[PDB]
Amino acid sequence: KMPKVQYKSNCKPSTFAYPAPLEPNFQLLDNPARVMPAQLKVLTMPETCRYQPFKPLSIGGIIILKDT
Amino acid sequence: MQIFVKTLTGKTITLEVEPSDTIENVKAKIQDKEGIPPDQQRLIFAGKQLEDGRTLSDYNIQRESTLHLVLRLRGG
Amino acid sequence: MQIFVKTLTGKTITLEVEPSDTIENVKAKIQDKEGIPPDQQRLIFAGKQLEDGRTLSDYNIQRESTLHLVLRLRGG
Amino acid sequence: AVDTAEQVYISSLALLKMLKHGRAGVPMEVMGLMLGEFVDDYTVRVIDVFAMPQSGTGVSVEAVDPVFQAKMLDMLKQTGRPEMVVGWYHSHPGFGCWLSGVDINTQQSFEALSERAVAVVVDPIQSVKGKVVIDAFRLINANMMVLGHEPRQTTSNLGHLNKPSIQALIHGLNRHYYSITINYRKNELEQKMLLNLHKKSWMEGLTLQDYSEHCKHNESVVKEMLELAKNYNKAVEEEDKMTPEQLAIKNVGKQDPKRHLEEHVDVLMTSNIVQCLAAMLDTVVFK
Amino acid sequence: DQTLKMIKILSGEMAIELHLQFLIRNNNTDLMILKNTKDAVRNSVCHTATVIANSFMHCGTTSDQFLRDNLEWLARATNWAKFTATASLGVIHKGHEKEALQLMATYLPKDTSPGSAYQEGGGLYALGLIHANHGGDIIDYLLNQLKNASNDIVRHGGSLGLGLAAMGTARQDVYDLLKTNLYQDDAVTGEAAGLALGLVMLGSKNAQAIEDMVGYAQETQHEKILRGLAVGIALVMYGRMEEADALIESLCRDKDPILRRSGMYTVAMAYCGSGNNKAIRRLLHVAVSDVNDDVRRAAVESLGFILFRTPEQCPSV
Amino acid sequence: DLYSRYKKLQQELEFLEVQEEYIKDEQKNLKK
């Protein structure tokens, strides 16, 4: 099973743009997000949640999320 | 009865014929089998080039003998 | 001495020959026992094609050697 | 269905034969027949070629009588080479490459007897020291465009590596017939023995060039070096007194001393080195 | 449980299914580009270009209405194009394994067996793209199907599918069947067999198999087989670096252009990621000096594989 | 860092002189 958990970007949204076309700096993210490999190092870790990343975040792929 | 012919591609052709058949009838049968215009095709046997009006009988041909067929050729 | 001829059909035919035999004569035996005329074949021997003016010894073929054989259809 | 990858292989011997025959009939359009085998539905090899006798119309030629080829196609099999015929060729001298409105007709029956047939064309007077102008063609039936289809369904890049000339495209080309790419079948042995062209006898390498004319040639060349050296410094003095834009024009009418001088130095040194080396080798190798 | 750990970690079908779920739920795309191209198609080349291109946009998204609503336009394509078209379906449903066999069986006209055999011949190929490594029983299934040897179109599609689905396994049965399929010396079977063999023999540096497969390539009339196996004899040899040198010193010694071309791919694949001085030196040298343009291409083509760990270098050369 | 000041210098020394080889061959082929 997967838990519902959230994150946010630290940076201007245009950097993570997925426009599909025809200022904040804290845009949130849900459990799985399209994250550009160059910008993994600028996401806000889920420090507000009760859950914590056991894998050192700012890395790709799946992580087990420890409830605390 | 039946007769054979061969050509420079290595192709062989077999015709049901009778000794009374004229050379022009043979040419007609060849076109009926393959569609070639009778004036572009030419026939040889016994070192002799054929002519239309004679017949298998007077050509002294015998069962299953093999004629040679050859093609007209020009530039232009 | 024995050799084996694996046809494209999968049928493998036993051929008895000798090093003094020649490829033309193996083709002759092939026509004898399978009817197929001598120009309708290619002999592959899992390598270069065989050539008819050569003896079996020229290919260093030995007892129980095996070969595969393909048809040689020409024209159409 | 046909495709855009078919490939034609020709031997060296067919090439030399075709060039010689086409060049001999230089004012007119000679003829010939070519033979080989279809090794598979993607590639065709032509192995050898033989000429044909014609009576020539002013515009073109027609094969005079078929008994000749009926003889030939069995006369030579007594010496191997059992191959069947695969195509024909004619030469256009200097016109270019295309099929005329009657060449097409001749190809029609070749294809009707065997659907894989080919036509070849060569240019013996425009081909120079390379880039011999050869091409290969085959007809297409207008039926396919009546359906609105196009021939040669395509699966690969390798057919589109060349473009036709404008002159070839004014004539029918794609609206009547299509071309096939060609390459040259080779082996090492014939190359190994052909490069002997213009090799020469060993003895030629050890000759001393008539010591009496050698000095005459030398001190003939020195004289024009004199008369040129006395004309060099004028063109050195005029180096800058006029606009350089017209300086190119200053060359066009009148030979310049500088460039015209140094070829004499080249000649003198090239001769006088080898003339001196050969004498030493001789004065050691014999007694 | 330690019992289910084997499937959880070594099967990893959980991970495949999770990636599928991610891609299916988070599918963002816009077909308007495709529609803008749709009227520009005027020839078969462009038609096949579009029908391959759109499949790239839909990798594993299981979305194919763009075909259903353009079915009669698609029916304009013919011959090998149809082989491509059905093949592209395998890309759209990459992963998706749990129903895949039935899914394509929904559309595979196997009982019809059309005289346009392409319509089935490509389906096996598609089935290979789905199971790019999780072959398992599917492997044997495809192998069993090849036992029909019905016609060389299906023989081609089958050898492709099986070679992909069983890659690197070095399963003996597939090596056997591909060997016997190559020896037919046929110009449309033998190259596909060669490729599939390269796939299943991946990285094995298997000496007896190499000595086997170079033999036919030394002496054959049909170029297609050489133009296929030129890849396989590189692919078997991955990463062994200097251990492969004996092969290289032979291939670059060959006079047949196709084998010299293959040598380039082989030296490329032997030294991936490491800019070994002799590798770069020889590979660059041959591009300057060979007489045949295709090998001159493939030579410089090979550099990218041996440089990719240091992108900042390549513009310097 | 101080060890990279040796490794990178070795690597550039390696990469240079292979630049020399193709240019040396290319000038030969060009006139040909």
**CA–CA separation, B21 and B58 (whole Å):** 10
What residues does each domain of chain D span? Answer: 7-195, 206-280
In the complex, which subunits touch F with 3 or more CB pairs below 8 angstroms? E
**CA–CA separation, D261 and E155 (whole Å):** 74
**Which residues fall within 8 angstroms of residue A12, CB to CB, at 6 or more apart?**
A23, A25
C-chain residues near D115 (CB < 8 A): 76
Tell me, rounded to whole angstroms, the distance of Cα E3 from its chain centroid.
35
Element at E256 (helix H, strand E)? none
**C-alpha pair distances (Å), D13 with each of D16, D76, D86:** 5, 16, 16
**Which residues fall within 8 angstroms of residue D255, CB to CB, at 6 or more apart?**
none
Query: How near does any CA of chain E get to the CA of C8, in Å?
Result: 8
User: Which residue is closest to F12 within chain E, CA to CA?
Assistant: E313
User: C26, C21, C47: which is closest to C36 by C-alpha?
Assistant: C26
Residue E208 in tokens: 């007896």
Backbone angles phi, psi at E49, to 5 degrees: -60, -45
D-chain residues near B50 (CB < 8 A): none
Is the pair C, E in contact (3+ CB pairs within 8 Å)?
yes
C-chain residues near E218 (CB < 8 A): 47
CA D19-D57-D170 angle, 5° bins: 65
In the complex, which subunits touch D with 3 or more CB pairs below 8 angstroms? B, C, E
Element at A43 (helix H, strand E)? strand A43-44
Query: How near does any CA of chain B get to the CA of C7, in Å?
Result: 24
**Which residues fall within 8 angstroms of residue D216, CB to CB, at 6 or more apart?**
none
Query: How near does any CA of chain D get to the CA of E252, in Å?
Result: 17
**CA–CA separation, E201 and E203 (whole Å):** 6
User: Which residue is closest to C39 within chain D, CA to CA?
Assistant: D82
Provide the β-strand partners of residue C13.
C5
E-chain residues near C68 (CB < 8 A): 183
**CA–CA separation, E260 and E280 (whole Å):** 16
Backbone angles phi, psi at D31, to 5 degrees: -140, 155
Residue F31 in tokens: 């006139």
For the residues of E128-171, what is the DSSP string, one character each?
HHHTSS--THHHHHHHHHHTT---HHHHHHHHHHHHHHTTT---
Element at D37 (helix H, strand E)? strand D31-40
> How would you classify residue D273: left for phi > 0, otherwise alpha for psi between -120 and 50, otherwise beta?
alpha
| Bridge-based pairing state of the strands D133-139 and D118-123 | antiparallel
Choose the closest CB to A20 out of E15, E22, E28.
E28
Provide the β-strand partners of residue A29.
A7
What is the signed CA dihedral for A45, A50, A56, A61, rounded to 10 degrees? -80
Provide the β-strand partners of residue C42.
C70
CA D166-D172-D173 angle, 5° bins: 70
Provide the β-strand partners of residue E42.
none
Q: Is residue C46 within 8 Å of residue C12, measured between CB atoms?
A: no
**Which residues fall within 8 angstroms of residue D185, CB to CB, at 6 or more apart?**
D9, D10, D11, D12, D45
CA E302-E308-E312 angle, 5° bins: 115
Question: CB D88 to CB B73 under 8 A?
Answer: yes
**CA–CA separation, C67 and A30 (whole Å):** 67
Question: CB D84 to CB C74 under 8 A?
Answer: yes
Q: Is A46 helix (H, G, I), strand (E, B) or coil?
A: coil
**CA–CA separation, D97 and D92 (whole Å):** 7
Choose the closest CB to E313 out of F15, F22, F29.
F15
CB-based contacts of E263-266 (< 8 A; 24+ apart in sequence)? E264/E295, E264/E298, E264/E299, E264/E301, E264/E302, E265/E230, E265/E231, E265/E234, E265/E298, E265/E302, E266/E233, E266/E234, E266/E237
Q: Is residue B12 within 8 Å of residue B73, measured between CB atoms?
A: no
- Burial (Cβ within 10 Å: 0-12, 13-18, ≥19) of residue B15: middle
Residue type, F7: K
**Which residues fall within 8 angstroms of residue E76, CB to CB, at 6 or more apart?**
E47
Question: CB E219 to CB C44 under 8 A?
Answer: no
Element at E38 (helix H, strand E)? helix E32-38
B-chain residues near C37 (CB < 8 A): none
Element at E179 (helix H, strand E)? helix E172-182
Burial D90-124 (b: 16+ CB within 10 A, else e): bbbbeebbbbbeebbebbebbeebbebbbbbbbbb
In the complex, which subunits touch C with 3 or more CB pairs below 8 angstroms? B, D, E
Number of residues that this document lists for chain F: 32
Final resolution, Å:
3.6
**CA–CA separation, E89 and E67 (whole Å):** 10
Residue E27 in tokens: 């599918």
Element at E73 (helix H, strand E)? helix E71-74
Q: Binding site: which residues of D?
A: 90, 92, 103
**CA–CA separation, E128 and E163 (whole Å):** 8
F23 touches chain E (CB under 8 A): no
E43 touches chain D (CB under 8 A): yes
User: E257, E249, E310, E315: which is closest to E282 by C-alpha?
Assistant: E249
E183 touches chain C (CB under 8 A): yes
D-chain residues near E221 (CB < 8 A): 39-40
User: E196, E132, E144: which is closest to E170 by C-alpha?
Assistant: E196
Q: Is residue E224 within 8 Å of residue E190, measured between CB atoms?
A: yes
Cβ-Cβ pairs closer than 8 A, B with C, add up to 5
For the residues of C25-72, what is the DSSP string, one character each?
HHHHHHHHHH---TTSEEE-TTSSPP-TTSBGGGGT--TTEEEEEEE-
Q: Binding site for Zn(2+): which residues of D?
A: 90, 92, 103
Q: Is residue D129 within 8 Å of residue D160, measured between CB atoms?
A: no
| Bridge-based pairing state of the strands D43-51 and D31-40 | antiparallel
Q: Is residue D98 within 8 Å of residue D172, measured between CB atoms?
A: yes
**C-alpha pair distances (Å), A53 with each of A7, A43, A46, C14, E67:** 11, 13, 8, 73, 43
User: B75, C75, E221: which is closest to D120 by C-alpha?
Assistant: B75
Q: Is residue D33 within 8 Å of residue D53, measured between CB atoms?
A: no
**CA–CA separation, E97 and E131 (whole Å):** 7
Establish how many alpha carbons lie within 13 A of residue D148's alpha carbon, considering only the half-sphere containing its beta carbon.
5
CA E182-E160-D1 angle, 5° bins: 80
**CA–CA separation, C60 and C67 (whole Å):** 13
Question: CB F22 to CB E317 under 8 A?
Answer: yes
E316 touches chain F (CB under 8 A): yes
Mutate to test the interface with E, among C6, C7, C44, C69 (most CBs of E within 10 A): C44
User: A40, A66, A68: which is closest to A54 by C-alpha?
Assistant: A66
Q: Is residue B26 within 8 Å of residue B61, measured between CB atoms?
A: no
Residue B34 in tokens: 């393959």
A64 touches chain E (CB under 8 A): no
Residue E173 in tokens: 């049965």
